[model samples]
Target: GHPEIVAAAVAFVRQIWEYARQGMSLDEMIAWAVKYAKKIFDLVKKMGASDEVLKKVMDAVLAAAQAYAQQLNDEAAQRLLVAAQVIVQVLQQLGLEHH
Candidate 1:
């Protein structure tokens, strides 16, 4: 497993969770996501990492999301969903294209 990718995911959650806990609007989530998207993108590129590595980390993200859904925490789960979407879009904005 790529420890770097795991490290990358940790900050995303901590920040997203902080926002969720603080009761900020969704735009704030999107704001942070735009920056995070670039952060992770360059972090991976520097190591010459692969998409599988990033996607594997993303799997755990979805896992947390389902856990939130399971706990009936609608707002957190929804925010996580939106954050994931923004990350995906911003990643694409940085050229994470599909064949």
Candidate 2:
């Protein structure tokens, strides 16, 4: 279960990476990120993941988004940063945090 959950998360991020490579517009990428975020949230919940596992998953997503933003200096990257910030807030609301 744990491995599957982690794999799913990685796959989702890879999809984002692929979409970005396709030269999607900022608005399109932002919308895609938001749509995936909810899907990820639901998947995590359905897996009955522990808080620690969920935190790790969210952290991975945030880190990837940050790296992408750093690599790309464009509106799409900015929107990715926005999405990453929203992910952090969502994790906090779910009771996960850096210590």
Candidate 3:
């Protein structure tokens, strides 16, 4: 469950990054990412996550979005990667795997 959920989170972020790379405006990408974040948050809540966990997840989402808008592509990618890993770890620590 941990691995699969992490993979899904990575894939979702990658998809949004691809959209950004494919000429989607920054604002549009951000809006779509926020929508995706809400979906993730809903799932986390259903898994019995606390508000603190939810805030961390949202922070990760926002960090990724900011990274996406960065001028340095390589730096942005690295930041996003780290953010995604953090999110996965956070979820795992919350016992999401048991769900």
Candidate 4:
């Protein structure tokens, strides 16, 4: 079955996205990202799966973050890429295969 963390992450991302579309500043967007990241972490602990699952979850998070950043500009997208790369590296360190 799909994990609850996945659902919570999706919802959190969507909420932030809607706010951005309504003209929220980058600072506000990032604040939301940090807040949502906490929720994702909490959900991750609650799921209690393996590193592999965590990697998959992080992959989805990166994908969503990239899409959100792209809508802003190249600079913002690059920044988001940096964060995503860091998270992806973490997943790799956890022994998951990098795509």
Best by lDDT: 1
Measured with C-alpha atoms, the lDDT of residue 90 in candidate 4 is 47
Clashing pairs in 2: none
Best by TM-score: 1
Q: Which candidate model has the greater lDDT, 2 or 3?
A: 2
lDDT of 4 by residue, 60-90 (tens): 8777766777675565565555544544454
Error of 3 at 65 (Å): 7.6
- Global local distance difference test of model 4: 0.60
lDDT of 3 at 1: 27
Q: Number of backbone collisions per candidate, in order?
A: 0, 0, 0, 0
Off by over 4 Å in 1: 68-72, 92-99
TM-score of each: 0.73, 0.66, 0.50, 0.62
Better of 1 and 2 by TM-score: 1
lDDT of 3 by residue, 4-77 (tens): 33344545676676764565555565566555555575576667656555555545554554555463376445
* Clashes by residue pair, model 1: none
Candidate 1 has an lDDT of 0.67
Over 3-99, each residue of candidate 2 has an lDDT whose tens digit, in order, gives 6665666566556665665666666766766676667666777777777777777777877777666656576576666656665566556444322
Please give the RMSD to the true structure for each candidate, in Å: 2.9, 4.2, 7.7, 5.2
Please report, in order, the local distance difference test score of every candidate based on alpha carbons: 0.67, 0.65, 0.54, 0.60
**Candidate ranking (TM-score, best to worst):** 1, 2, 4, 3
Q: How do the candidates rank by lDDT, highest first?
A: 1, 2, 4, 3
Q: List the residue pairs that clash in candidate 3.
A: none
Model 2 lDDT, residue 10, Cα: 56
